[PDB]
Amino acid sequence: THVREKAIDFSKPFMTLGVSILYRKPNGTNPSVFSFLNPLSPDIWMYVL
């Protein structure tokens, strides 16, 4: 880089690269029917039937 070019002199790079990002994998999820009440209030269900 430039501030090290100020510091010392350079022959050809052996690998030119950047910064990247490291994150995990979701490794699956859980489907319903284990919740299906989510938009509605959890109180009012049977009273129609």
Partner: peptide, 22 residues
């Protein structure tokens, strides 16, 4: 809320249908 206590009008129709005529 918006989700509870709405059932009254059908029982009020029942009152008109049955309660009306004793």
């Amino acid at each position: 809320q918006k989700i509870g206590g709405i059932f009254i009008v059908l029982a009020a129709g029942l009152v008109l249908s049955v309660l009306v005529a004793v």
